[PDB]
Amino acid sequence: LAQMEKSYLEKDERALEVTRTVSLAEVYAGLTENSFILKDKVTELVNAG
Amino acid sequence: TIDGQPLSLSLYATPADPSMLLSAAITASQGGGDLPHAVMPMYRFPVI
C-alpha cells in the first residue's frame, strides 16, 4: 500500500479541465451521411412514433 | 637396595595448568544509506 501510495504521489499531477459544449443539431446537420435537421425530424418521429 | 628398589626417589614434575578460555565479539560496519532523489508532490505542506 505504501509503494502504491508513493507511485500515486509521484504520478499524480494537476489537470487540464475542459468543458466542451456539443449540440446535437450541429452534429446531426454536419454528419454527411443521412444528415438531417433535428427540429423537424423530432416532430416527424413524435407525431408518428 | 638388596631387593632392587631405588634409594633416590623419582621425579614427579608439575603437570600443565588449566588454561583460561578466550573468545571475542568481532565487529563489522555497514555504512549509512545514500539519501534518495526528492520528488515534488502536488499537495501543500500540511497534507504531505
Experimental method: cryo-EM
Candidates B40, B38, B48, B45; CA nearest to A13 is B40
Environment class of A35 (CB within 10 Å of its CB; exposed 0-12, middle 13-18, buried 19+): exposed
Nearest-neighbour CA in chain A from B46: distance (Å): 15
Q: Is A12 on the interface with B (CB under 8 A)?
A: yes
Alpha-helical runs (H) found in chain B: none
- Amino acid residing at A28: Y
Residues ≥6 apart with Cβ < 8 Å to A3? none
- Would you give the DSSP letter of residue B45? T
A14: chain B residues, CB-CB within 8 Å: 42
Candidates A10, A11, A6, A45; CA nearest to A28 is A45
Distance CA(A20)–CA(A27), nearest Å, equals: 13
Say if residues A45 and A39 touch (Cβ distance below 8 Å): no
Distance CA(B41)–CA(A13), nearest Å, equals: 8
Q: If DSSP codes are grouped into helix, strand and coil, which group holds residue B18?
A: coil
